[PDB]
Amino acid sequence: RKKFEGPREAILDLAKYKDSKIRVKLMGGKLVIGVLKGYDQLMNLVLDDTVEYMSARKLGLTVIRGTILVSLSSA
Amino acid sequence: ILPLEVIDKTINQKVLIVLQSNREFEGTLVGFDDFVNVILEDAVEWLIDSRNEKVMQHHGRMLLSGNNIAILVPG
Amino acid sequence: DLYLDQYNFTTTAAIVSSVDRKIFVLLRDGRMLFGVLRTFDQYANLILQDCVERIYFSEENKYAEEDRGIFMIRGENVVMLGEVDIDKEDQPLMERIPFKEAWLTKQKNDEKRFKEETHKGKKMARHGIVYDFHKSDMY
Amino acid sequence: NLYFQGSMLPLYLLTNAKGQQMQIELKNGEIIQGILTNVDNWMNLTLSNVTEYSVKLNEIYIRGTFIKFIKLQDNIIDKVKQ
Amino acid sequence: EFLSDIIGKTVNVKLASGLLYSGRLESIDGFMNVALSSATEHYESNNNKLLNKFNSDVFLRGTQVMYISEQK
Amino acid sequence: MLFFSFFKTLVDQEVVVELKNDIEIKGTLQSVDQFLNLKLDNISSTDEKKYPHLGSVRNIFIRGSTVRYVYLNKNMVDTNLLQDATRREVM
Amino acid sequence: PLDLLKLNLDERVYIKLRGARTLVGTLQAFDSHSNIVLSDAVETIYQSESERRSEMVFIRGDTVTLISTP
Numbered sequence: 001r002k003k004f005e006g007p008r009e010a011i012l013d014l015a016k017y018k019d020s021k022i023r024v025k026l027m028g029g030k031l032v033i034g035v036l037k038g039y040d041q042l043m044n045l046v047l048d049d050t051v052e053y054m055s056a057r058k059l060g061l062t063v064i065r066g067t068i069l070v071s072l073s074s075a
Numbered sequence: 076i077l078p079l080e081v082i083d084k085t086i087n088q089k090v091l092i093v094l095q096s097n098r099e100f101e102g103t104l105v106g107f108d109d110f111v112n113v114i115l116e117d118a119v120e121w122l123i124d125s126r127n128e129k130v131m132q133h134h135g136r137m138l139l140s141g142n143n144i145a146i147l148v149p150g
Numbered sequence: 151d152l153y154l155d156q157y158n159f160t161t162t163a164a165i166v167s168s169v170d171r172k173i174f175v176l177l178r179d180g181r182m183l184f185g186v187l188r189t190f191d192q193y194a195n196l197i198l199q200d201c202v203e204r205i206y207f208s209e210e211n212k213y214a215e216e217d218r219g220i221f222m223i224r225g226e227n228v229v230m231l232g233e234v235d236i237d238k239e240d241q242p243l244m245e246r247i248p249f250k251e252a253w254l255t256k257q258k259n260d261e262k263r264f265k266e267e268t269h270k271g272k273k274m275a276r277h278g279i280v281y282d283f284h285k286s287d288m289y
Numbered sequence: 290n291l292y293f294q295g296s297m298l299p300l301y302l303l304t305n306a307k308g309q310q311m312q313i314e315l316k317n318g319e320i321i322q323g324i325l326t327n328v329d330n331w332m333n334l335t336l337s338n339v340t341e342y343s344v345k346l347n348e349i350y351i352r353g354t355f356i357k358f359i360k361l362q363d364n365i366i367d368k369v370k371q
Numbered sequence: 372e373f374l375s376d377i378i379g380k381t382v383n384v385k386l387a388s389g390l391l392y393s394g395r396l397e398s399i400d401g402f403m404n405v406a407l408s409s410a411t412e413h414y415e416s417n418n419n420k421l422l423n424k425f426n427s428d429v430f431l432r433g434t435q436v437m438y439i440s441e442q443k
Numbered sequence: 444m445l446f447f448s449f450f451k452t453l454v455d456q457e458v459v460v461e462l463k464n465d466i467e468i469k470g471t472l473q474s475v476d477q478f479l480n481l482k483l484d485n486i487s488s489t490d491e492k493k494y495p496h497l498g499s500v501r502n503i504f505i506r507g508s509t510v511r512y513v514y515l516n517k518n519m520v521d522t523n524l525l526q527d528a529t530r531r532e533v534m
Numbered sequence: 535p536l537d538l539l540k541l542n543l544d545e546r547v548y549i550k551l552r553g554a555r556t557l558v559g560t561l562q563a564f565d566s567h568s569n570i571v572l573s574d575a576v577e578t579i580y581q582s583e584s585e586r587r588s589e590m591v592f593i594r595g596d597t598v599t600l601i602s603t604p
């Protein structure tokens with residue numbers, strides 16, 4: 001039985017989820033939803049109509065830094 | 076649409092910079108390097124969390140270290 | 151010319167000796183953890199077999215155990231790990247309470263701290279003190 | 290005998306665990322259990338049939354550096370052995 | 372470089388703990404370490420108070436600063 | 444690589460290590476790595492109430508980051524040498 | 535700035551640490567990471583002021599906030 005090795009596990013996936021709302025949680029204890037417009041390799045990403053749950057507020061186009069991102073899921 | 080390009084696009088434009096912790100910085104984006112470390116003009120310093128507390132009206136330039144930068148907001 | 155080293159000073163050298171042995175692990179959140187160490191790496195990422203989580207209570211001389219299983223521990227979260235000793239590990243060990251209570255009491259006891267420390271600290275900086283206390287570093 | 294015998298690495302187990310189920314704990318305290326669909330050398334991973342504790346979901350991506358420890362299937366060591 | 376233009380000025384250096392330190396900027400580097408002269412410390416803003424003053428040079432550890440900003 | 448080199452001249456000697464806990468552990472030093480992670484041998488902590496297993500442990504290996512202080516005797520190394528080595532360091 | 539540290543090497547320096555603590559000692563060595571050695575040092579933990587001294591201590595850079603002269 002083939003012993004797999006480390007595998008862009010989502011980077012191609014970044015392509016897949018575009019144009020749709022997604023859920024992002026960031027270091028610090030703050031998450032945010034919003035339609036994903038653009039994305040890069042380093043996972044930095046652009047989100048429209050961003051809402052920032054804190055522990056909500058509207059915010060327009062934004063760039064979230066993919067060096068602080070923690071988990072990304074669809075909403 | 077590319078994130079950095081979005082920030083390249085932003086230069087010379089009023090920008091908000093939200094940090095992992097409950098603290099927002101707003102002013103004019105003078106420019107940013109690869110680590111996304113940000114340079115800001117006439118920056119207002121905010122700690123939020125509702126009632127907002129303004130901390131300083133930074134007159135002149137500021138080097139804001141990118142570690143903490145979580146979301147960049149045009150305007 | 152060349153300066154020799156007496157011992158193998160590397161992370162791997164220290165860790166390897168505990169392989170296939172039973173070790174303790176202290177987590178940054180304060181979880182105690184016991185088990186037999188299978189494999190590890192230079193970043194001290196560990197795999198434990200027959201892992202067992204163990205809340206202590208020397209105040210009232212009681213302890214709890216819960217069977218954890220096979221865990222892969224990401225190393226940055228470890229305060230310290232040690233090779234146990236089945237020679238001096240039977241006499242030291244109290245009546246043992248049921249676990250479910252422990253997490254409950256542990257949560258309340260460990261929780262009450264976060265607030266208190268986070269409240270008694272916040273009022274330290276305003277004076278010129280440095281008391282950084284998070285909810286993940288309570289070991 | 291997974292170490293000296295196979296010179297195994299933690300990553301090499303999590304890499305072979307695809308399609309198995311695992312409970313991940315994140316530095317937040319959040320418990321995430323789902324079905325591992327993929328993993329990377331930095332230990333970031335995608336999961337399926339995710340259930341997130343503290344929102345049932347279908348897929349999810351996690352960062353390697355915000356993991357605490359991963360609880361895995363009991364038989365996993367056996368599977369690697371063969 | 373902001374740092375070159377910046378060098379020699381009265382700057383503000385805020386640290387992670389939010390302790391503000393105001394001084395004349397003798398030197399700085401790549402890890403973002405910061406040398407000052409006659410640095411005084413306030414919790415969030417100078418107006419807020421003074422908790423300490425240093426009549427001598429100060430060294431601040433790059434990992435702790437969130438910003439360097441010129442006093443005007 | 445100066446502090447790394449420092450300790451190896453400190454191997455096989457007694458010392459105490461105050462964690463960010465405030466916890467203090469005394470033991471004989473057995474190893475270091477360039478990460479200034481510490482391995483010790485003859486354990487005896489001060490707060491033997493919170494950690495009651497530190498008695499049945501042959502070995503403990505400590506992550507550097509957790510450390511706050513390491514306490515040593517004066518007679519354990521050269522102040523002139525340290526200062527000299529520190530001078531040469533590029534940094 | 536690392537050098538400014540070279541300047542006062544072997545002299546009394548003041549260190550302010552993350553942990554509600556503050557220290558004084560002669561400075562014997564220092565590191566790009568700020569790991570520091572202090573011969574003849576004394577420290578001040580707040581709580582409201584307490585002190586403990588040891589002939590020599592290694593200080594973990596991770597904790598160090600700022601260094602200066604007393």
Ligand SMILES: [Cl-]
Binds near residue numbers: 444445446448478
């Ligand atoms: Cl080193």
Ligand SMILES: [Cl-]
Binds near residue numbers: 567569
């Ligand atoms: Cl180091």
